[PDB]
Enzyme design. Structure first.
Site, PDB file in Angstrom:
ATOM      1  N   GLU A 115     -27.229  35.095  -4.790  1.00 32.14           N
ATOM      2  CA  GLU A 115     -26.549  36.128  -4.024  1.00 32.14           C
ATOM      3  C   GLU A 115     -25.540  36.847  -4.910  1.00 32.14           C
ATOM      4  O   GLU A 115     -24.705  36.195  -5.548  1.00 32.14           O
ATOM      5  CB  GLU A 115     -25.846  35.526  -2.812  1.00 32.14           C
ATOM      6  CG  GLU A 115     -25.503  36.546  -1.748  1.00 32.14           C
ATOM      7  CD  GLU A 115     -24.948  35.913  -0.492  1.00 32.14           C
ATOM      8  OE1 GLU A 115     -24.697  34.689  -0.502  1.00 32.14           O
ATOM      9  OE2 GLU A 115     -24.775  36.641   0.509  1.00 32.14           O
ATOM     10  N   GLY A 175     -28.895  26.884   0.036  1.00 35.54           N
ATOM     11  CA  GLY A 175     -30.131  27.210  -0.645  1.00 35.54           C
ATOM     12  C   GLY A 175     -30.004  27.227  -2.152  1.00 35.54           C
ATOM     13  O   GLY A 175     -30.684  26.464  -2.845  1.00 35.54           O
ATOM     14  N   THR A 176     -29.141  28.102  -2.674  1.00 35.79           N
ATOM     15  CA  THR A 176     -28.980  28.209  -4.120  1.00 35.79           C
ATOM     16  C   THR A 176     -28.267  26.989  -4.688  1.00 35.79           C
ATOM     17  O   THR A 176     -28.660  26.469  -5.738  1.00 35.79           O
ATOM     18  CB  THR A 176     -28.216  29.486  -4.469  1.00 35.79           C
ATOM     19  OG1 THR A 176     -28.941  30.622  -3.986  1.00 35.79           O
ATOM     20  CG2 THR A 176     -28.050  29.616  -5.974  1.00 35.79           C
ATOM     21  N   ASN A 184     -16.448  18.372   3.709  1.00 36.45           N
ATOM     22  CA  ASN A 184     -15.654  19.540   4.078  1.00 36.45           C
ATOM     23  C   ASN A 184     -14.483  19.169   4.979  1.00 36.45           C
ATOM     24  O   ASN A 184     -13.320  19.314   4.591  1.00 36.45           O
ATOM     25  CB  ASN A 184     -16.537  20.586   4.754  1.00 36.45           C
ATOM     26  CG  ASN A 184     -17.224  21.494   3.757  1.00 36.45           C
ATOM     27  OD1 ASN A 184     -18.444  21.651   3.780  1.00 36.45           O
ATOM     28  ND2 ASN A 184     -16.439  22.106   2.876  1.00 36.45           N
ATOM     29  N   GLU A 233     -16.122   7.349 -20.398  1.00 31.92           N
ATOM     30  CA  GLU A 233     -15.619   6.133 -19.772  1.00 31.92           C
ATOM     31  C   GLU A 233     -16.070   6.037 -18.320  1.00 31.92           C
ATOM     32  O   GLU A 233     -16.224   4.935 -17.783  1.00 31.92           O
ATOM     33  CB  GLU A 233     -14.094   6.083 -19.832  1.00 31.92           C
ATOM     34  CG  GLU A 233     -13.435   6.328 -21.186  1.00 31.92           C
ATOM     35  CD  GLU A 233     -13.944   5.466 -22.319  1.00 31.92           C
ATOM     36  OE1 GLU A 233     -14.323   4.300 -22.085  1.00 31.92           O
ATOM     37  OE2 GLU A 233     -13.923   5.961 -23.465  1.00 31.92           O
TER      38      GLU A 233
END
Ligand SMILES: Nc1nc2c(ncn2[C@@H]2O[C@H](COP(=O)(O)OP(=O)(O)OP(=O)(O)O)[C@@H](O)[C@H]2O)c(=O)[nH]1
Ligand SMILES: Nc1nc2c(ncn2[C@@H]2O[C@H](COP(=O)(O)OP(=O)(O)O)[C@@H](O)[C@H]2O)c(=O)[nH]1
Ligand SMILES: [Mg+2]
Lengths: 430, 186, 217, 50, 431, 47
Positions: free
Chosen positions: A62, A135-136, A197, A245
């Site tokens: 996009e 999607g992307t 989220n 590490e």
């Protein structure tokens, strides 16, 4: 020299990177013009006469989030060829980002990955920022990480994936693109750190005492986690704890490489003065389940391996005295076969604060990346979510028509069960 | 050496029983000993190599380092006693491309490693005495694409009791084995 | 079946227990794998504890690919290629710090050859869980790359199911059995992109590594 | 009732996707049918030229 | 004319050894620039033990620095007393071992071993009459525990008549700083029992109790622990650099403190430690240092010395003191509590004096102890081993670098053999 | 030449920056303002 390359995929990848690259500029004093008024060599490469460019590529199908950076306040910082754009988006379709549209743009993506890797002397790893629910961010990131494993061997991949929450999410087809991405993030990514989220919404709601924050406030303290885990390369400290590490100490079995994240001091300006930022306080607050960036209950599972990234005026004793009290507490349970569970890294720089940011200027900080068997509970939320939607095969013809066969869903779901059956295999006591 | 003196069938390279056992074999010891001891179960004199370090003490069939050995046979049979200790033997071969490839088997490793010059091998043995049938042609065909021509060096550097190490063309069991090659005598 | 100092009595018989601890540990690992497999509900080879050889052959494939890439896939750095190829010796000086108190990284990298301490192709012929693989080792041919037999069996199974027309994800009451990527032939090694990359770099790959050995025997 | 509703839903969906892919095949047919007269006339031109 | 090559491996070895050369430069009067500015001739009498004379009369340390990550050498070079070292001695890598013993000892460390051994061979052959090679590193890490023990094994083949003073820190009992501490500690101790001639054992937790209980430092920094460790290292070599009524070199310590060839792990401690609230009330005498010497809280090892018998203990006294006070105090410490000493070695104490005390103190002493109570340390790490070894957890990172799993069973069966003889020597009695 | 004088000035600036970094490292590598072992004040070592 310590030199990292970061890749940002999908609309979440740039917007986290916009908050990320705002912070690295202030850490080394780099202006948005790109001019400083030796420690910068990791995330920045010197170019010609006093100009520093980021070691990153912002690729998204996009063009909306890419040209916003091109017209934004950082139009001089980034190389215009690094910002890779496309014509149409993947449009919340894993098949579109992996088969149809993602094939044409991944060739141009590796042309600049090769250019970035050749200019820098020593690669230390890869930092991928994407959202597996899109999607992307999932489909094109699945193809990109598949390139990087088959081409750039033995260089570790640090995965920062924004992952769907069972309580709320902002797309109908979140189960499909996240399940289909599970095959790529298992075999290819060396180290995967999960993010969720609305688990970090509750960080802003409770700790920062802000009732209505947005994606901009969401991604700023994501950059606090990202900068703190990479801060050992940039600045000297008591325990220099590099990128390699993390891969050697946080994963016992090569496919269970999923770890959590938690930033201990999350306080506003007005709450900073009243409360005493003790090392025993922040270490206790970091191990609290509320401070996790993903919804996990560590009481449900057991810790597998924990890495602690201390910053500021942390003496090597208060890190020892605070974590000794961590082991004595009953509510923090470790797995039985790992007696030596903690990895401590102490750095010598306080965290920077952006102008206008919510977080206050604090002397000490803790960023904990921890492996736990409660991380398998996140995938169990997506399991019944996927199978109930896949039972009637809704939202499938979008994937079928864009190159994929209908059978690809079957081994993708059955790959997810291999991840679930692995977590409750390693959690079983012997 | 040993190219013109070719015998049909078996070719004994070292036999412990005799007036002088170490007739052609060079000797090398370092914090160890080489000792001709008559064992308990066989009641026959067998040579014994002992050492606190595996890589220090060894015996090699070609006495001079520059000289080479030649046997065209693809089998090497060693009769050794399992001492419940480290064992290690090493055979160098000349392959089709006139290249020197060293197959080196030991008791202190469990995974085989194939480097372009030297291949390392695990060895597992039974309880008491034993015979080991190192198949030269099969092992060099598994390790590399080339085929066996001759064996240049054979060397045991171990803690073991050796007697009757020799070369064979093919697998020969007890009932077709020659008169003095038994060590069991049924 | 059935005079000397204490340090010597320890040292003489210490190598016997050096041997014995490994088969004790192998029996312990076999019983732990069996108990874990019965507890969780999967095959012992399918277990996460036995993924060591897979990571080993993955490491060998990555190292052989990196040392057998062409110059441009390895890196087109104008300073690196030129100053490495200035003479028969291949070393580059990487400066660190200022010129006053400076440090040097001496990068030595000879193209077309693995390092002597890195040139090793390691497989295990004694662990029985790799017996269907015929010795878990590194394969550089595209036909035998990864796990071909299980992938072919799964392809035959899915083709047979598609031809029979059955539906598999119809019911939510039945959870799928948890087979691994190595079981379905969808591990890292079985990727089509390693397949095409090894196919396109195959000749110099065989120049570096002459023969893929069959570690079964 | 619920069980027959399940099976008729599955039959309906498979029939619909069969018709969709059939129409896609029709579109492919009518889109690549245009390359046939040009290769016919070019082959005839080749034959007359030889 | 006896002289010691210093080799610092890993982040721990570089950080401790940076503080170690701070004491040695200050004791010999070498300034930050490197030039001599001592006020006594006795400092300059033996400088060639640790320093090589260069142009301008300034002295460069005989130190070889090795680590596979360039971050640690930036702190050492740019830090104070960092310009004394030679940049050619800064032999170091780029990729980074990263807490993996397999990467430091087999794959990634091996391409640098031929480079570090080249500059050690240059330093060893140039100087005239060597003593040994003093090496400072860790055991919980993988870059210094891995690459350091490869040099120790390799330098034993080249020079078998020289000793190996190793100062290796161990995993802490209460805390782990790396998740793979039991893997790297067991795999390095097995590489040290047959290679290193004598071993000094340190840990962070024992120094934390020293800094808090005795020195009253509530916020003991990262170099405060290194200062206590550096004072021990100078105390071991005190008779070489300076004269005395009873001089005892490195070979005299190992011929006295090592009864049997594998019992060469020692616990150490620096005696005159006091807080500034109690500096003016402490009467620094031979009885006062001896009281602080033999206390368990003064030892820099996690193992409590009350649990086992001292097989052999040595003390390297410094200062203008009478030998009889040194003689009668160490005679008295044996007789008052003879249960805590072994019985079949009469005269367990090796006593020696150096007439020059360190700068700022009128009297000092450095204590070495070969106590069988140190078997509690190896028992704890092996207990952490079998918990992690039985599930193959964090094991594919080690076997992915070409290592067989035989070396794991090889390592702990020498660790179990090491702890077994410590127990049997304590239990053994004469007549 | 002026290039040589500029090189000398750049070297002096490098020395000043190294002195600042050394001051920072010493100041946060020593906790208390007094020597731990002996009675001695702590000073930044200059010569
Ligand atoms: N943490 C964080 N997550 C974000 C942010 N913006 C979007 N996301 C996540 O990304 C999802 C939105 O879809 P994306 O994954 O960004 O879409 P995409 O990657 O561009 O894929 P396409 O839209 O098909 O091209 C949301 O569900 C969020 O979970 C952000 O600013 N911060
Ligand atoms: N006493 C002391 N211990 C240290 C110091 N630096 C590191 N360590 C210890 O070394 C261990 C970690 O070693 P590490 O840094 O990983 O070594 P590396 O793997 O060689 O780089 C930890 O247990 C620390 O306690 C130091 O300056 N002083
Ligand atoms: Mg998008």
């Amino acid at each position: 020299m310590r030199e990292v390359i970061s890749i940002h995929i999908g609309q979440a990848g740039i917007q986290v990177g916009n908050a990320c690259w705002e912070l690295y500029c202030l850490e080394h004093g780099i202006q948005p013009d790109g001019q400083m008024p030796d420690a910068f060599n990791t995330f920045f490469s010197e170019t010609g006469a006093g100009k520093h460019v980021p070691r990153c590529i912002f690729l998204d199908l996009e063009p909306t989030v890419v040209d916003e950076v091109r017209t934004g306040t950082y139009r001089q910082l980034f190389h215009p060829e690094q910002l890779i754009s496309g014509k149409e988006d993947a449009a919340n379709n894993f098949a579109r980002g992996h088969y149809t549209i993602g094939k044409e743009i991944v060739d141009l993506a590796l042309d600049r990955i090769r250019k970035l890797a050749d200019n820098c002397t020593g690669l230390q790893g890869f930092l991928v920022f994407n959202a597996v629910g899109g999607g992307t961010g999932s489909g094109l990131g699945s193809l990109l990480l598949e390139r990087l494993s088959v081409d750039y061997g033995k260089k570790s991949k640090l995965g920062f994936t924004v992952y769907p929450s069972p309580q709320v999410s902002t797309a109908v087809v979140e189960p499909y693109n996240s399940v289909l991405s599970t095959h790529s993030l298992l075999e290819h990514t060396d180290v995967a750190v999960m993010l969720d989220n609305e688990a970090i919404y509750d960080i802003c709601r409770r700790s920062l005492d802000i009732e209505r924050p947005t994606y901009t406030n969401l991604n700023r303290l994501i950059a606090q986690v990202i900068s703190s885990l990479t801060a050992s390369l940039r600045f000297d400290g008591a325990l220099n704890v590099d990128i390699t590490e993390f891969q050697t100490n946080l994963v016992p079995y090569p496919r269970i490489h999923f770890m959590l994240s938690s930033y201990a001091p999350i306080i506003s300006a007005e709450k900073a003065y009243h409360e005493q930022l003790s090392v025993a306080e922040i270490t206790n607050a970091a191990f609290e389940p509320a401070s996790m960036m993903v919804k996990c209950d560590p009481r449900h599972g057991k810790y597998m391996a924990c890495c602690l990234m201390y910053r500021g005026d942390v003496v090597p004793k208060d890190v020892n005295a605070s974590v000794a009290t961590i082991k004595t507490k009953r509510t923090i349970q470790f797995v039985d076969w790992c007696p030596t569970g903690f990895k401590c890294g102490i750095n010598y720089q306080p965290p920077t604060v952006v102008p206008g940011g919510d977080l206050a200027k604090v002397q000490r900080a803790v960023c904990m990346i921890s492996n736990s068997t409660a991380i398998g509970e996140i995938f169990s939320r997506l399991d019944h979510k996927f199978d109930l939607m896949y039972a009637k095969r809704a939202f499938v013809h979008w994937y079928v028509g864009e190159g994929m066969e209908e059978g690809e869903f079957s081994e993708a779901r059955e790959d997810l069960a291999a991840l679930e059956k692995d977590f409750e295999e390693v959690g079983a006591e012997s | 050496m040993f190219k013109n003196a070719f015998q049909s069938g078996f070719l004994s390279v070292l036999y412990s029983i005799g007036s002088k056992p170490l007739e052609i074999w060079d000797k090398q010891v370092s914090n160890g000993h080489i000792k001709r001891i008559t064992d308990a179960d066989i009641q026959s004199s067998v040579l014994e190599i002992m050492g606190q370090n595996v890589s220090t003490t060894y015996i090699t069939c070609p006495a001079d380092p520059n000289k080479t050995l030649g046997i065209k046979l693809p089998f090497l049979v060693l009769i050794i006693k399992n001492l419940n200790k480290y064992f290690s033997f090493e055979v160098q071969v000349l392959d089709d491309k006139n290249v020197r490839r060293r197959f080196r088997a030991s008791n202190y490793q469990s995974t085989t490693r194939v480097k372009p010059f030297i291949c390392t091998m695990p060895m597992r043995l039974d309880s008491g005495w034993n015979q080991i049938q190192f198949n030269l042609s099969d092992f060099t065909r598994r390790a590399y694409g080339t085929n066996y021509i001759e064996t240049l060096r054979v060397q045991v550097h171990a803690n073991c009791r050796i007697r009757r190490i020799y070369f064979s063309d093919r697998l020969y069991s007890e009932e077709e084995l020659p008169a003095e090659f038994k060590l069991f005598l049924p | 079946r059935r005079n000397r100092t204490i340090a010597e009595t320890m040292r003489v018989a210490a190598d016997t227990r050096k041997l014995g601890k490994f088969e004790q540990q192998q029996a312990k690992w076999d019983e732990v794998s069996s108990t874990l497999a019965y507890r969780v509900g999967r095959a012992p080879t399918e277990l996460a504890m036995q993924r060591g050889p897979a990571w080993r052959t993955r490491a060998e494939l990555t190292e052989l690919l990196y040392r057998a890439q062409p110059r441009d896939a390895r890196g087109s750095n104008p300073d690196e290629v030129w100053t490495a190829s200035l003479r028969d010796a291949w070393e580059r000086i990487l400066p660190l710090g200022s010129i006053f108190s400076g440090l040097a990284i001496k990068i030595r990298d000879r193209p077309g050859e693995l390092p002597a301490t890195r040139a090793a192709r390691v497989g295990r012929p004694l662990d029985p869980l790799l017996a269907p693989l015929g010795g878990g080792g590194t394969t550089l041919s595209p036909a035998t790359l990864g796990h071909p037999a299980a992938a072919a069996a799964h392809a035959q199974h899915v083709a047979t199911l598609a031809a029979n027309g059955v539906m598999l994800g119809a019911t939510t009451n039945k959870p799928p059995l948890g087979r691994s990527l190595s079981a379905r032939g969808r591990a890292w090694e079985d990727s089509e992109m390693l397949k095409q990359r090894v196919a396109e770099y195959g000749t110099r790959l065989r120049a570096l590594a002459p023969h893929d050995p069959d570690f079964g025997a | 009732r619920k069980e027959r509703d399940f099976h008729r839903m599955h039959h309906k969906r498979v029939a619909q996707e069969k018709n969709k892919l059939l129409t896609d095949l029709r579109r492919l047919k009518e889109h690549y049918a245009k390359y046939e007269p040009t290769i016919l006339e070019l082959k005839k031109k080749y034959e007359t030229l030889m | 004319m006896r002289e010691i090559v210093h080799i610092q491996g890993g982040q721990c070895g570089n950080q401790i050894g940076a503080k170690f050369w701070e004491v040695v430069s200050d004791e010999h009067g070498i300034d930050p620039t490197g030039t001599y500015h001592g006020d006594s001739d006795l400092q300059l009498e033996r400088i060639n033990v640790y320093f090589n004379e260069a142009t301008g009369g300034r002295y460069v340390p005989r130190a070889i620095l090795m680590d596979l990550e360039p971050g640690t050498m930036d702190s050492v070079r740019s830090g104070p007393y960092g310009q004394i070292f030679r940049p050619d001695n800064f032999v170091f890598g780029q990729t980074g071992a990263g807490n993996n013993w397999a990467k430091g000892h087999y794959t990634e460390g091996a391409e640098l071993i031929d480079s570090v051994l080249d500059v050690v061979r240059k330093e060893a052959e140039s100087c005239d009459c060597l003593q040994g090679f003093q090496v400072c590193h860790s055991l919980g890490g993988g870059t210094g525990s891995g690459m350091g023990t490869l040099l120790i094994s390799k330098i034993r083949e080249e020079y078998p008549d020289r000793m190996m003073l190793t100062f290796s820190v161990v995993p802490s009992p209460k805390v782990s700083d790396t998740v793979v501490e039991p893997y790297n500690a067991t795999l390095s101790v097995h590489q040290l029992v047959e290679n290193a001639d004598e071993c000094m054992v340190l840990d962070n937790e024992a120094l934390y109790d020293i800094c808090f209980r005795t020195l009253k430092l509530t916020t003991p920094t990262f170099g405060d622990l290194n200062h206590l460790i550096s004072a021990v290292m100078s105390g071991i070599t005190c008779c070489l650099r300076f004269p005395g009524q009873l001089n005892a070199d490195l070979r005299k310590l190992a011929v006295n403190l090592i009864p049997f060839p594998r019992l060469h792990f020692f616990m150490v401690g620096f005696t005159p430690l006091t807080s500034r609230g109690s500096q003016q009330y402490r009467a620094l005498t031979v009885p006062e240092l001896t009281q602080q010497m033999w206390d368990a809280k003064n030892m820099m090892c996690a193992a409590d010395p009350r649990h086992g018998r001292y097989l052999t203990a040595s003390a390297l006294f410094r200062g203008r003191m009478s030998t009889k006070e040194v003689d009668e105090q160490m005679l008295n410490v044996q007789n008052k509590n003879s249960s805590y000493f072994v019985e079949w070695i009469p005269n367990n104490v090796k006593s020696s004096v150096c007439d020059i005390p360190p700068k700022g103190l009128k009297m000092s002493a450095t204590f070495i102890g070969n106590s069988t109570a140190i078997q509690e340390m190896f028992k704890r790490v092996s207990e952490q081993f079998t918990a992690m070894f039985r599930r193959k957890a964090f094991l594919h990172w080690y076997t992915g670098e070409g290592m067989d799993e035989m070396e794991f069973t090889e390592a702990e069966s020498n660790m179990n053999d090491l702890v077994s003889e410590y127990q049997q020597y304590q239990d053994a009695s004469a007549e | 030449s002026s290039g040589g004088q500029q090189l000398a000035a750049k070297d002096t600036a490098v020395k000043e920056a190294r002195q600042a970094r050394a001051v920072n490292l010493y100041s946060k590598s020593h906790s208390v303002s007094h020597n731990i072992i002996t009675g001695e004040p702590i000073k930044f070592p200059t010569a």
